[PDB]
C-alpha cells in the first residue's frame, strides 16, 4: 500500500503467506522472499543480445554442431526466448482497468 | 682460344598468392525467426445469455 508502483494490480494482493514455528539456527526469526516482477526480462534480453553476437557470425558454434546439433535448433530456441521477452512486455504496464459488454437498448425518453 | 665459361643465370621464381578465399565468419549467418506473434489474453468473453 506504500509502494504500489512496485506491484501489479490486475493480480490482486500479490503475496502468499506462510507461518512456521521453526526459525533457522541461532536466530529469533527470519523469512525468505521469492517473487517474479516485470524487471526480470533483462536476463532474457541480456542472454539474447549476447547470443546474437555469437550466432550472427556462427562464432564458437562449431563446438555445438560438433556434437551433431542443427543450426535451426538455435533458431527455434532464440525465437522461444524473444517470445518470452514479448510475454513480460504483454504484462509490463498492463491495465488493471475495468471492462464490460453492454445492451444496445433504449427507452421512450421524456427527461 | 676462347677461355672457358663465365656465364650463369639467377635461380628465381617470383612469389604471388592465388585462390586465397576470404572465408572469415564476419557475415557467416543471415537466418531469422520472429519472437512469436501478437495475441490478446487480457479480456473476458462476458457470454451471460
Curated annotation (Swiss-Prot), chain A:
UniProt subcellular location: Cytoplasm, Cytoskeleton
Feature: compositional bias, Acidic residues: 95-111
Source domain of life: Eukaryota
Renumbered residue ranges of the record's region Disordered: 90-111
Membrane-spanning residues: none
5-glutamyl polyglutamate modified-residue sites: 104
Post-translational modification: Some glutamate residues at the C-terminus are polyglycylated, resulting in polyglycine chains on the gamma-carboxyl group. Glycylation is mainly limited to tubulin incorporated into axonemes (cilia and flagella) whereas glutamylation is prevalent in neuronal cells, centrioles, axonemes, and the mitotic spindle. Both modifications can coexist on the same protein on adjacent residues, and lowering polyglycylation levels increases polyglutamylation, and reciprocally. Cilia and flagella glycylation is required for their stability and maintenance. Flagella glycylation controls sperm motility.
Miscellaneous remark of the record: The highly acidic C-terminal region may bind cations such as calcium. Pig brain contains at least two forms of this protein.
Subunit text: Dimer of alpha and beta chains. A typical microtubule is a hollow water-filled tube with an outer diameter of 25 nm and an inner diameter of 15 nM. Alpha-beta heterodimers associate head-to-tail to form protofilaments running lengthwise along the microtubule wall with the beta-tubulin subunit facing the microtubule plus end conferring a structural polarity. Microtubules usually have 13 protofilaments but different protofilament numbers can be found in some organisms and specialized cells. Interacts with NCKAP5L.
Family per similarity comment: Belongs to the tubulin family.
Domain note: The MREI motif is common among all beta-tubulin isoforms and may be critical for tubulin autoregulation.
Function summary: Tubulin is the major constituent of microtubules, a cylinder consisting of laterally associated linear protofilaments composed of alpha- and beta-tubulin heterodimers. Microtubules grow by the addition of GTP-tubulin dimers to the microtubule end, where a stabilizing cap forms. Below the cap, tubulin dimers are in GDP-bound state, owing to GTPase activity of alpha-tubulin.
Protein name, entry field: Tubulin beta chain
Record lineage: Eukaryota, Metazoa, Chordata, Craniata, Vertebrata
From Swiss-Prot, chain B:
Domain notes: The tau/MAP repeat binds to tubulin. Type I isoforms contain 3 repeats while type II isoforms contain 4 repeats.
Residues the record lists as Phosphoserine modifications: 7, 26
Cross-link position per record: Glycyl lysine isopeptide (Lys-Gly) (interchain with G-Cter in ubiquitin): 13, 19, 23, 33, 45, 49
Site (Not glycated): 13, 19, 23, 33, 42, 45
Tau/MAP repeats mapped onto the chain: 8-38
Full protein stretch here: 616 to 664 of 758
Residues bearing glycans: 49
PTM-bearing positions, type N6,N6-dimethyllysine: 13
Consequence of substituting residue 3 to L: In FTD1; most common mutation; reduction in the ability to promote microtubule assembly; accelerates aggregation of tau into filaments
Recorded disease: In Alzheimer disease, the neuronal cytoskeleton in the brain is progressively disrupted and replaced by tangles of paired helical filaments (PHF) and straight filaments, mainly composed of hyperphosphorylated forms of TAU (PHF-TAU or AD P-TAU). O-GlcNAcylation is greatly reduced in Alzheimer disease brain cerebral cortex leading to an increase in TAU/MAPT phosphorylations. Frontotemporal dementia 1: A form of dementia characterized by pathologic finding of frontotemporal lobar degeneration, presenile dementia with behavioral changes, deterioration of cognitive capacities and loss of memory. In some cases, parkinsonian symptoms are prominent. Neuropathological changes include frontotemporal atrophy often associated with atrophy of the basal ganglia, substantia nigra, amygdala. In most cases, protein tau deposits are found in glial cells and/or neurons.
Residues with PTM N6-acetyllysine: 13, 19, 23, 33, 45, 49
Annotated consequence of substituting residue 39 to M: In FTD1; ultrastructural and biochemical characteristics indistinguishable from Alzheimer disease; accelerates aggregation of tau into filaments
Official protein name in the record: Microtubule-associated protein tau
Domain of life: Eukaryota
Post-translational modification: Phosphorylation at serine and threonine residues in S-P or T-P motifs by proline-directed protein kinases (PDPK1, CDK1, CDK5, GSK3, MAPK) (only 2-3 sites per protein in interphase, seven-fold increase in mitosis, and in the form associated with paired helical filaments (PHF-tau)), and at serine residues in K-X-G-S motifs by MAP/microtubule affinity-regulating kinase (MARK1, MARK2, MARK3 or MARK4), causing detachment from microtubules, and their disassembly. Phosphorylation decreases with age.
Cellular location(s): Cytoplasm, Cytosol; Cell membrane; Cytoplasm, Cytoskeleton; Cell projection, Axon
Amino acid at each position: 500500500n506504500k509502494n504500489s508502483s512496485y506491484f501489479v494490480e490486475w493480480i490482486p494482493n500479490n503475496v502468499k503467506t506462510a507461518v512456521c514455528d521453526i526459525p533457522p539456527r541461532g536466530l529469533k526469526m527470519s523469512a525468505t522472499f521469492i517473487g517474479n516482477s516485470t524487471a526480470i526480462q533483462e536476463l532474457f534480453k541480456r542472454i539474447s543480445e549476447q547470443f546474437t553476437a555469437m550466432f550472427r557470425r556462427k562464432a564458437f558454434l562449431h563446438w555445438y554442431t560438433g556434437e551433431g546439433m542443427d543450426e535451426m535448433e538455435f533458431t527455434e530456441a532464440e525465437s522461444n526466448m524473444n517470445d518470452l521477452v514479448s510475454e513480460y512486455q504483454q504484462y509490463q504496464d498492463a491495465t488493471a482497468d475495468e471492462q464490460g459488454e453492454f445492451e444496445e437498448e433504449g427507452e421512450e425518453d421524456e427527461a | 682460344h676462347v677461355p672457358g665459361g663465365g656465364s650463369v643465370q639467377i635461380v628465381y621464381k617470383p612469389v604471388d598468392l592465388s585462390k586465397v578465399t576470404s572465408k572469415c565468419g564476419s557475415l557467416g549467418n543471415i537466418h531469422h525467426k520472429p519472437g512469436g506473434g501478437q495475441v490478446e489474453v487480457k479480456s473476458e468473453k462476458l457470454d451471460f445469455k
